[PDB]
Amino acid sequence: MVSTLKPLKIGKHTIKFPIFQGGMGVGISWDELAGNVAKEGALGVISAVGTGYYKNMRFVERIVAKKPFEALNFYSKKALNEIFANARKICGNNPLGANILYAINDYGRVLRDSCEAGANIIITGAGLPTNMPEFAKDFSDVALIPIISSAKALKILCKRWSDRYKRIPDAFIVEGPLSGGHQGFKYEDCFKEEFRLENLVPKVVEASKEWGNIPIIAAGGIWDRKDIDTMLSLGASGVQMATRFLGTKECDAKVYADLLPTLKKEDILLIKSPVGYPARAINTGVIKRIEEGNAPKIACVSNCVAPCNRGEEAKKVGYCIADGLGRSYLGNREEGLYFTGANGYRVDKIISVHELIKELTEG
Ligand SMILES: Cc1cc2nc3c(=O)[nH]c(=O)nc-3n(C[C@H](O)[C@H](O)[C@H](O)COP(=O)(O)O)c2cc1C
Numbered sequence: 001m002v003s004t005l006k007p008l009k010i011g012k013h014t015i016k017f018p019i020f021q022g023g024m025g026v027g028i029s030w031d032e033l034a035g036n037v038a039k040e041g042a043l044g045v046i047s048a049v050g051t052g053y054y055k056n057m058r059f060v061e062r063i064v065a066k067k068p069f070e071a072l073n074f075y076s077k078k079a080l081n082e083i084f085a086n087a088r089k090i091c092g093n094n095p096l097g098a099n100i101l102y103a104i105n106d107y108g109r110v111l112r113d114s115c116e117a118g119a120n121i122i123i124t125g126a127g128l129p130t131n132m133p134e135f136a137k138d139f140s141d142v143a144l145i146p147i148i149s150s151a152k153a154l155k156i157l158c159k160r161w162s163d164r165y166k167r168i169p170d171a172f173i174v175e176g177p178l179s180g181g182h183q184g185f186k187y188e189d190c191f192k193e194e195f196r197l198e199n200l201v202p203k204v205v206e207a208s209k210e211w212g213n214i215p216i217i218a219a220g221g222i223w224d225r226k227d228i229d230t231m232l233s234l235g236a237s238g239v240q241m242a243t244r245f246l247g248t249k250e251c252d253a254k255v256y257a258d259l260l261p262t263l264k265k266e267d268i269l270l271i272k273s274p275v276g277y278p279a280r281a282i283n284t285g286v287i288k289r290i291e292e293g294n295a296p297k298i299a300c301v302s303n304c305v306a307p308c309n310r311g312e313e314a315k316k317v318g319y320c321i322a323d324g325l326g327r328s329y330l331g332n333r334e335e336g337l338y339f340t341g342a343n344g345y346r347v348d349k350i351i352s353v354h355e356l357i358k359e360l361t362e363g
């Protein structure tokens with residue numbers, strides 16, 4: 001209960017602790033996880049990606065081959081609505097974020113869906129989101145946070161936003177190459193010291209000065225309070241952590257509770273992705289299937305991302321990301337796709353969200 005960490009303002013919202021739990025798709029950070037995180041005083045973040053899979057396609061208008069049909073059902077507005085409502089059953093009006101990748105043509109639709117669902121903050125990476133306020137203008141209080149890989153991206157985003165909307169972002173998340181999910185770096189760049197998070201945060205904070213010290217949130221490889229204090233000392237206003245929350249009981253993708261305590265370092269790797277960024281995965285499930293020559297059939301049903309071009313890149317790399325992540329949420333251990341930060345092998349026990357926050361904030 002006693003902490004020396006100080007409350008964090010993001011636009012018009014305040015969170016008790018300067019910690020975000022990073023969004024994780026598909027079905028990893030939904031209502032149980034995000035709700036309990038926000039209940040603890042950190043920022044819970046609901047993933048808006050693949051919400052059609054929620055409760056085994058409870059809220060989709062059409063299913064093909066046990067997949068949500070097209071982007072309208074993959075990014076399901078009614079599913080998102082119920083996920084926010086069920087999270088707020090836990091955390092009340094405590095601030096909640098909605099994480100939405102940029103690499104989708106229906107980006108504005110999902111952004112407005114998140115706003116109408118009750119999100120206080122929109123977080124967007126997997127691209128350079130130069131037009132978030134275009135879609136958020138009916139919702140003045142919703143704070144807008146790009147995820148960036150470099151100080152150059154901060155400067156570009158601030159200039160484009162300022163010139164077009166007379167608004168600049170409410171915060172920036174800089175994500176490094178030790179993160180879960182997709183990386184904002186070429187594979188070769190993920191191993192280079194120049195892109196380590198401790199080197200990115202100083203540059204991004206210095207770039208932020210020019211625009212009035214927009215708060216910076218460091219993400220990628222942050223494990224414990226020592227890492228948090230390191231990032232804060234480098235100028236970051238907060239941290240975003242995901243892998244630690246991937247190992248909590250309240251994770252909405254229950255498979256991880258059985259997968260992580262067995263996870264060995266040598267079974268984490270960077271792979272290719274239809275999204276067009278390296279993805280950090282566990283060497284299990286669909287990956288193993290592909291290497292056996294038992295790859296699931298690929299035929300684009302959910303149309304989840306623009307860079308794939310309705311199956312072109314999925315067929316090239318060998319897997320459909322929507323299919324695999326949805327299968328993981330539904331408990332398919334043989335054909336699921338499973339993601340992790342570099343630190344995933346350090347998960348020994350599955351603990352509660354409350355005990356994790358107590359660890360991260362005590363003192
Ligand atoms: C399993 C998993 C799935 C993720 N999926 C997404 C995602 O869909 N969208 C996103 O912006 N970030 C995603 N991330 C990245 C996290 O939000 C976060 O920025 C990063 O994992 C933090 O690093 P850490 O895991 O070392 O704390 C994912 C991370 C993990 C571990």
Ligand SMILES: Cc1cccc(NS(=O)(=O)c2nnc(NC(=O)c3ccc4ccccc4c3)s2)c1
Binds near residue numbers: 124149182184185325
């Ligand atoms: C600027 C820049 C570039 C790259 C990464 C970052 N870093 S990041 O925005 O924090 C992210 N890390 N992982 C992410 N994963 C996803 O978008 C994702 C996860 C699951 C999907 C499933 C189906 C379809 C699309 C899907 C997309 S996004 C920042």
Ligand code: SF4
Binds near residue numbers: 274303304305319
């Ligand atoms: S084939 Fe490509 S665009 Fe279609 S659902 Fe799979 S990854 Fe997404």
